[PDB]
Design an enzyme around this catalytic site. Structure first.
Site, PDB file in Angstrom:
ATOM      1  N   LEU A   1       0.829  -1.356  -0.012  1.00 16.67           N
ATOM      2  CA  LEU A   1       0.105  -0.010   0.187  1.00 16.67           C
ATOM      3  C   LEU A   1       0.733   1.213   0.099  1.00 16.67           C
ATOM      4  O   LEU A   1       0.509   2.158  -0.796  1.00 16.67           O
ATOM      5  CB  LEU A   1      -1.042  -0.018   1.071  1.00 16.67           C
ATOM      6  CG  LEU A   1      -2.280  -0.525   0.962  1.00 16.67           C
ATOM      7  CD1 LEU A   1      -3.364  -0.434   2.067  1.00 16.67           C
ATOM      8  CD2 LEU A   1      -3.028   0.161   0.023  1.00 16.67           C
ATOM      9  N   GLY A   2       1.984   1.219   0.922  1.00 16.97           N
ATOM     10  CA  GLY A   2       2.703   2.499   0.927  1.00 16.97           C
ATOM     11  C   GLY A   2       4.059   2.539   1.841  1.00 16.97           C
ATOM     12  O   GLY A   2       3.933   1.286   2.614  1.00 16.97           O
ATOM     13  N   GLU A   3       4.847   3.028   1.745  1.00 15.17           N
ATOM     14  CA  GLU A   3       5.952   3.004   2.433  1.00 15.17           C
ATOM     15  C   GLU A   3       6.239   4.502   3.273  1.00 15.17           C
ATOM     16  O   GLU A   3       6.109   5.355   2.618  1.00 15.17           O
ATOM     17  CB  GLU A   3       7.093   2.591   1.610  1.00 15.17           C
ATOM     18  CG  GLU A   3       8.607   2.949   2.042  1.00 15.17           C
ATOM     19  CD  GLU A   3       9.115   1.626   2.919  1.00 15.17           C
ATOM     20  OE1 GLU A   3       8.459   1.254   4.069  1.00 15.17           O
ATOM     21  OE2 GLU A   3       9.891   1.165   2.565  1.00 15.17           O
ATOM     22  N   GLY A   4       6.968   4.415   4.357  1.00 16.91           N
ATOM     23  CA  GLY A   4       7.197   5.480   5.089  1.00 16.91           C
ATOM     24  C   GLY A   4       8.592   5.111   6.110  1.00 16.91           C
ATOM     25  O   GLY A   4       8.763   4.122   6.187  1.00 16.91           O
ATOM     26  N   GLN A   5       9.047   6.424   6.515  1.00 10.66           N
ATOM     27  CA  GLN A   5       9.892   6.079   7.703  1.00 10.66           C
ATOM     28  C   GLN A   5       9.630   5.141   8.686  1.00 10.66           C
ATOM     29  O   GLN A   5      10.706   4.358   9.138  1.00 10.66           O
ATOM     30  CB  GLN A   5      10.609   7.542   8.088  1.00 10.66           C
ATOM     31  CG  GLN A   5      10.855   7.695   9.516  1.00 10.66           C
ATOM     32  CD  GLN A   5      12.217   7.417   9.878  1.00 10.66           C
ATOM     33  OE1 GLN A   5      13.186   7.840   9.292  1.00 10.66           O
ATOM     34  NE2 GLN A   5      12.446   6.402  10.831  1.00 10.66           N
ATOM     35  N   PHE A   6       8.419   5.518   9.390  1.00 11.87           N
ATOM     36  CA  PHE A   6       8.332   4.637  10.574  1.00 11.87           C
ATOM     37  C   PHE A   6       7.899   3.219  10.222  1.00 11.87           C
ATOM     38  O   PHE A   6       8.029   2.199  11.044  1.00 11.87           O
ATOM     39  CB  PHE A   6       7.211   5.305  11.528  1.00 11.87           C
ATOM     40  CG  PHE A   6       7.651   6.271  12.457  1.00 11.87           C
ATOM     41  CD1 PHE A   6       8.749   6.084  13.148  1.00 11.87           C
ATOM     42  CD2 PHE A   6       6.978   7.471  12.600  1.00 11.87           C
ATOM     43  CE1 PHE A   6       9.290   6.925  14.054  1.00 11.87           C
ATOM     44  CE2 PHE A   6       7.427   8.494  13.471  1.00 11.87           C
ATOM     45  CZ  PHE A   6       8.560   8.369  14.168  1.00 11.87           C
ATOM     46  N   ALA A   7       7.148   3.139   9.253  1.00  6.71           N
ATOM     47  CA  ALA A   7       6.666   1.489   8.885  1.00  6.71           C
ATOM     48  C   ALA A   7       6.433   1.266   7.560  1.00  6.71           C
ATOM     49  O   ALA A   7       6.407   2.292   6.628  1.00  6.71           O
ATOM     50  CB  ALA A   7       5.316   1.401   9.553  1.00  6.71           C
TER      51      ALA A   7
ATOM     52  N   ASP B   1      -1.704  15.604  14.936  1.00 12.82           N
ATOM     53  CA  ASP B   1      -1.265  15.360  13.532  1.00 12.82           C
ATOM     54  C   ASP B   1      -2.481  15.326  12.237  1.00 12.82           C
ATOM     55  O   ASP B   1      -2.468  14.694  11.599  1.00 12.82           O
ATOM     56  CB  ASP B   1      -0.494  14.109  13.539  1.00 12.82           C
ATOM     57  CG  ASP B   1       0.500  14.193  12.385  1.00 12.82           C
ATOM     58  OD1 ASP B   1       1.328  14.977  12.492  1.00 12.82           O
ATOM     59  OD2 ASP B   1       0.331  13.397  11.434  1.00 12.82           O
TER      60      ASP B   1
END
Ligand SMILES: Nc1ncnc2c1ncn2[C@@H]1O[C@H](COP(=O)(O)OP(=O)(O)NP(=O)(O)O)[C@@H](O)[C@H]1O
Ligand SMILES: Nc1ncnc2c1ncn2[C@@H]1O[C@H](COP(=O)(O)OP(=O)(O)NP(=O)(O)O)[C@@H](O)[C@H]1O
Ligand SMILES: [Mg+2]
Ligand SMILES: [Mg+2]
Lengths: 307, 254, 279, 292, 65
Positions: free
Chosen positions: A9-15, A128
């Site tokens: 689905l997606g990629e990020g710094q935390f997870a 946030d």
């Protein structure tokens, strides 16, 4: 034999967020796998943001708040199961194909405000709030998500880490370094999201905290001590030029009078006097005609060289 | 900068290792120099459309020339090579590159996104991740510190970009030699001075050494209005570049 | 908030009989597993309870002299984690010392008491090699501990309800001239409450009100009027009867608590050490 | 790509996962950064492209060795030399006792040598923090994490999202400057040097304004005399409080006169006046450096 | 379909807690620590802390498992 990874689905710094099926009811879910981070945190244990998300979402249950279905974890890596959300408000805002009629904006604002009122009744600040943190489902139900920055407020002497939202939606009190705040920080971000919905572009897109404050004061006026009694006492306060500010109905020409009053209330420079979610929901704008759009009817998102 | 000399020396070291194989053009069975010029002109148009830096264009041209020196590419895939090299140069040089959707939309969807992705991978594999190649832009920037005339710098950039369009005379010259020749030609055209002595002692290039590329560049400047590819001239006619493409080139160069 | 919390929905039980049933069930499950693996080494549920009480006291002592000073909410959360974990598990499977260290670690992380791992392990009274070994064990057991709590990490303590009751007394109860003198004794009673299983049986507000009323009774002050009128319980006498019944049950639970005996603790510790090497 | 045996998972970052692995055919312990090129809607990441491209040309004893690059249909493997721990962990474990001064000087000398090699190869690191500096058992320290690294053959523009952590951030970046320069790396290295000396961050700010105010408090509010052009910076506000510079004796107590002079040259407000990497390598501070 | 506001109805199983704006008029704020000007600048008032304390004190008081 519990979850069949079927997409990324997606990629990020935390997870890393991917898509899966429960294999029990064949339900569609979004699994957030928490990364190990830097090797320097290998002795820290489970990620603190993951624990924050788990602990906060295990105590909340509202239609407009993302639900944590499961929190299974391999001892090497912990994973959090949420409902799958089709899209979010940012995609709808940036999509030029669909038109945001006043009823669409009113419905989105109503779902956001009801979720926020539920959140604030349990003494929790989201902290946030931004359009891509307001996820949408196939049934058009807006849910607040990304509770990694969320924390409980109300108890004094609980100043903690300086985690703040991106500067575009940061309230002026946070930009001045306030340690102790209330629901006003979410209310200002809600006003910014409403401005984005009305303009289809970010209301105050500063490139730095100082430039963010400059844009805020240029658009809404540099506040005096009448409209913000203790402005100068904030730890990161700096003096600014006395900008007269643009009248509200010039920025929002198509906005009505009740919408203008709601926008003014959400953008009050005094955090104590800024209207709460309960106050905003009692406003005349939401009870005026037309009514909010039902969730089902909300919109869903050169030359070739001849060689 | 006290490291500046070192950087220049380092550039002179790698421009040799990043030079395309000379004479590779006749070993290509399908594609000729005219369509290479057309491809470079299209890349100039793309850089104008997306407001990319000149360094991106120069890097993309270098990547294309190095790729074509080891692989045979059909006339249908040459534009795909150009698009993939431009995407790689944007990834390496731009602050944030445009998404591949815009890199395939500019080609009116001649190649799908997957083709662009695969050819970018192939270009990376052939180049062996050697993408930091010295260009004429970098050497011109290094030379500009020994002046400062805005019009001279703009016209030097214009001539350096003109050097990319033609591969027949210019592929045998290193980027440093071409940058020196273009700087001299701009200095003659605008202010009437010559190759500065400080630059001779810095780079070791005298006037006689620059003479061949200098005369080639002079002929290119003279024939720029008649050249089939005119996107560089239209680019430099704007007030941003101080309108030096419409200037009058010298008829004689001593 | 407590009224719609996971603590109320899953971790408050109707009687001590359920608690005893769960602990005996855990002991029986461990005995069945061990005998299926391949007799006087196994500990009875009451011996397990004695060891649990001793190790909870050890956890309290560890948290008392922690540097930096732990907030009381963190200590309460750690103690509640220990109780909840050993409700459904056996001390013969996971050593109570490492489980109490893991409970303290998790309570620090959950309650936003930002301390680093070297800090926490430096609070141990052990050699640096032992500190590293204990850190590795805590890291290993952290996610298992989170499992056995069913990922219910928010724990509601009686301290904030105690403060709120004191505020309400100072405001709406002029009869009590100064509720402040009720603090220390009530605090002491709260600690006594923390020793028993009342945290798994009653709400934090009931516990705090019970402590307040016990402290008042000790001082010769009665607030039947506070419950009957300020809390508006004169309109519903049934609820008032249940409230006094709950308070009297809590007082009896405190009165019947028996601290462990040092020699019995030594024998049970020896037995646990022997059993933790026979599996 | 069968030549490596995965021993464990070192850590996972923004886009890749790092494994500690053994070279089966040789026996050399290495680090494998696996970056899944699938699930990518843009291709090989720009950060990975820049990192590999710049790291292939940086063959230095004080820069992490990129032994091999493995390109596969839908994944990319980077083989690096393995280092046991980084500087951040080293000072986290050396707290309450302090890294010795000879070791401090040797580490700073090696960092400056690596940075001088980077700058003489027109490479701007831009991400100098203790968590990005890897040490080994024999006393070497190497620059790593070239994810923010850029080539400055042409000027490098400042981008808000890609930027070093706040504690090691130069004031020109904090005042809204437009172009990077080799001075920001020197600023970060000086902050790291002060942190190693004092066992804590020089400017542990929490926001951009707080970081700028801590900088102004420690070094004095900048007027046009110290930094010509500061008053015309995009985010410079005239009403900035006028703190006064405090003497470096209480800023870095254990450091001697040579160390304090060097540090004050690394912390010049004007990026032009800030000491360069090799000019720092030619400072009296390093007259007696012996790798311990 | 027009919108008409309806307040949230969550049972607290305890005594009714006075409204936030009426806490000063009822004399509750005289027994809580006053908010600093720095706290007031960010929107933090002693009324919030008093209301939270009262809600915690009255939550679940009448509840039996
Ligand atoms: N409940 C969900 N259902 C479906 N997709 C989700 C859900 N939550 C997150 N995602 C996806 O996960 C991706 C990761 O983004 P996010 O979780 O914001 O990571 P991030 O980039 O670290 N966050 P930020 O830095 O605040 O933008 C998003 O782009 C979403 O598409
Ligand atoms: N050569 C190496 N030797 C040992 N450890 C390494 C090496 N290269 C990388 N690592 C480790 O791998 C981890 C992740 O690497 P990387 O993918 O660069 O993440 P990062 O850049 O540190 N994190 P972020 O900036 O938040 O994305 C780090 O914590 C390093 O400790
Ligand atoms: Mg998000
Ligand atoms: Mg990195």
């Amino acid at each position: 034999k519990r979850y069949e990874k079927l997409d990324f689905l997606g990629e990020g710094q935390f997870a890393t967020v991917y898509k899966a099926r429960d294999k029990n009811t064949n339900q569609i879910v979004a699994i957030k796998k928490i990364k190990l981070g830097h090797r320097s945190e290998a002795k820290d244990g489970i990620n603190r943001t993951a624990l924050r998300e788990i602990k906060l979402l295990q105590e909340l249950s509202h239609p407009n708040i993302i639900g944590l279905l499961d929190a299974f974890g391999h001892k090497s890596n912990i994973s959090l199961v949420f409902d799958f959300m089709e899209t979010d408000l940012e995609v709808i805002i940036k999509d030029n194909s669909l038109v945001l009629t006043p009823s669409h904006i009113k419905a989105y604002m109503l779902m956001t405000l009801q979720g926020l009122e539920y959140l604030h009744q349990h003494w929790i600040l989201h902290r946030d709030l931004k359009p891509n943190n307001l996820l949408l489902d196939e049934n058009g139900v807006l849910k607040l998500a990304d509770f990694g920055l969320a924390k409980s407020f109300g108890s004094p002497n609980r100043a903690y880490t300086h985690q703040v939202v991106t500067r575009w939606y940061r309230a002026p009190e946070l930009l001045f370094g306030a340690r102790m705040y209330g629901v006003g920080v979410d209310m200002w971000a809600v006003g910014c999201i409403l401005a984005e919905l009305l303009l289809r572009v970010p209301f105050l897109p500063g490139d730095s905290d100082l430039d963010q404050l400059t844009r805020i004061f240029e658009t809404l006026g540099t506040p005096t001590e009448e409209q913000w009694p203790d402005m100068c006492s904030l730890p990161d306060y700096v003096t600014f030029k006395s900008f007269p500010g643009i009248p509200l109905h010039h920025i929002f020409s198509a906005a009505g009078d009740d919408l203008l009053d709601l926008i003014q209330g959400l953008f009050l420079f005094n955090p104590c006097a800024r209207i709460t979610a309960t106050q905003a929901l009692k406003m005349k704008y939401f009870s005026n005609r037309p009514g909010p759009t039902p969730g089902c009817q909300l919109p869903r998102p050169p030359k070739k060289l001849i060689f | 900068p006290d490291y500046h000399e070192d950087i220049h020396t380092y550039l002179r070291e790698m421009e040799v290792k990043c030079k395309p194989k000379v004479g590779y053009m006749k070993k290509q069975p399908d594609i000729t120099n005219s369509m290479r010029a057309i491809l470079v002109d299209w890349l100039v148009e793309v850089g104008e459309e997306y407001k990319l830096q000149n360094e991106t264009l120069h890097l993309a041209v270098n990547y294309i020339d190095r790729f074509l020196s080891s692989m045979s590419v059909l006339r249908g895939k040459l534009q795909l090579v150009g698009t993939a090299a431009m995407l790689l140069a944007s990834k390496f040089e731009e602050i944030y590159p445009p998404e591949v959707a815009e890199f395939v939309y500019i080609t009116d969807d001649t190649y799908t996104k997957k083709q662009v992705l695969r050819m970018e991978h192939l270009v990376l594999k052939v180049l062996t991740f050697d993408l930091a190649a010295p260009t004429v832009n970098q050497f011109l920037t290094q030379y500009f510190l020994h002046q400062a005339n805005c019009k001279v710098e703009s016209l030097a950039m214009f001539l350096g970009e003109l050097s990319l369009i033609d591969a027949d005379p210019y592929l045998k010259y290193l980027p440093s030699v071409i940058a020196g020749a273009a700087f001299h030609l701009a200095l003659y055209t605008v202010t009437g001075q010559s190759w500065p002595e400080s630059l001779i002692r810095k780079t070791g290039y005298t006037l006689e050494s620059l003479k061949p590329c200098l005369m080639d560049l002079h002929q290119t400047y003279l024939k720029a209005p008649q050249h089939a590819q005119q996107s560089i001239r239209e680019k430099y006619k704007n007030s941003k570049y101080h309108g030096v493409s419409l200037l009058n080139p010298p008829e004689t160069l001593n | 908030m407590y009224h719609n919390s996971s603590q109320k929905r899953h971790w408050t039980f109707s009687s001590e009989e359920q608690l005893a049933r769960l602990r005996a069930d855990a002991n029986r499950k461990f005995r069945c597993k061990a005998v299926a693996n391949g007799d006087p080494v196994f500990l009875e549920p009451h011996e397990e309870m004695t060891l649990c009480k001793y190790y909870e006291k050890r956890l309290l002592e560890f948290c008392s002299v922690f540097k930096p000073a732990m907030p009381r909410s963190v200590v309460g959360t750690a103690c509640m984690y220990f109780k909840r974990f050993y409700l459904n598990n056996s001390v013969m499977e996971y050593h109570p010392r490492i489980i109490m260290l893991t409970c303290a670690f998790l309570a620090c992380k959950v309650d936003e008491f930002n301390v680093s791992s070297p800090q926490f392990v430096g609070n141990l009274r052990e050699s640096p090699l032992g500190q590293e070994k204990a850190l590795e064990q805590i890291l290993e057991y952290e996610l298992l501990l989170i499992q056995q709590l069913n990922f219910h990490l928010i724990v509601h303590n009686p301290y904030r309800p105690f403060e709120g009751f004191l505020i309400d007394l100072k405001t709406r109860y002029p009869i009590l001239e100064n509720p402040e003198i009720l603090r220390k004794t009530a605090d002491d009673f709260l600690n006594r409450i923390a020793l028993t299983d009342a945290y798994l049986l009653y709400t934090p507000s009931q516990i705090a009100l019970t402590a307040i009323l016990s402290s008042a009774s000790r001082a010769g002050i009665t607030m039947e009027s506070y419950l009957s009128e300020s809390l508006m319980l004169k309109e519903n006498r049934t609820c008032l009867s249940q409230l006094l019944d709950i308070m009297k049950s809590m007082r009896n639970l405190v009165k019947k608590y028996e601290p462990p005996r040092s020699e019995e603790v030594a024998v049970l510790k020896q037995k646990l050490e022997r059993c933790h090497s026979a599996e | 790509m069968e030549n490596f045996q995965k021993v464990e998972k070192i850590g996972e970052g923004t886009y890749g996962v790092v494994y500690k692995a053994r070279n089966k055919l040789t026996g050399e312990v290495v680090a494998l950064k696996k970056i899944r090129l699938d699930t990518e809607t843009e291709g090989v990441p720009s950060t990975a492209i820049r990192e590999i491209s710049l790291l292939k040309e940086l063959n230095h004893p004080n820069i992490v060795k990129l032994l091999d690059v493995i390109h596969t249909e839908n994944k990319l493997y980077l083989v690096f030399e393995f280092l046991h721990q980084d500087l951040k962990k080293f000072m986290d474990a050396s707290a309450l006792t302090g890294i010795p001064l000879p070791l401090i000087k040797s580490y700073l000398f090696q960092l400056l040598q690596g940075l001088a090699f980077c700058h003489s190869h027109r490479v701007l690191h831009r991400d100098l923090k203790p968590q990005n500096l890897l040490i080994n058992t024999e006393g070497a320290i190497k620059l790593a994490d070239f994810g923010l690294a850029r080539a400055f053959g042409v000027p490098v523009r400042t981008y808000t999202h890609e930027v070093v952590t706040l504690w090691y951030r130069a004031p020109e970046i904090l005042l809204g400057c437009k172009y990077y320069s080799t001075a920001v790396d020197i600023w970060s290295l000086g902050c790291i040097f002060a942190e190693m000396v004092t066992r804590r961050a020089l400017f542990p700010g929490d926001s951009e304004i707080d970081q700028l105010f801590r900088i102004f408090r420690t070094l004095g509010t900048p007027d046009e005399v110290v930094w010509p052009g500061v008053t015309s910076m995009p985010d410079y506000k005239p009403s900035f409080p006028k703190w006064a510079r405090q003497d470096f004796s209480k800023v870095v107590p254990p450091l001697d006169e040579d160390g304090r002079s060097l540090l004050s040259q690394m912390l010049h407000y004007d990026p032009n006046k800030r000491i360069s990497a090799k000019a720092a390598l030619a400072h009296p501070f390093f007259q007696d450096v012996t790798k311990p | 379909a027009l919108y008409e506001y309806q307040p949230l109805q969550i049972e607290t199983y305890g005594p009714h807690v006075p409204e936030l704006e009426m806490l000063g008029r009822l004399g509750y704020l005289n027994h809580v620590r006053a908010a600093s000007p720095q706290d007031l600048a960010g929107g933090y008032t002693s009324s919030l802390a008093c209301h939270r304390a009262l809600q915690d004190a009255f939550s679940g008081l009448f509840w039996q498992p």
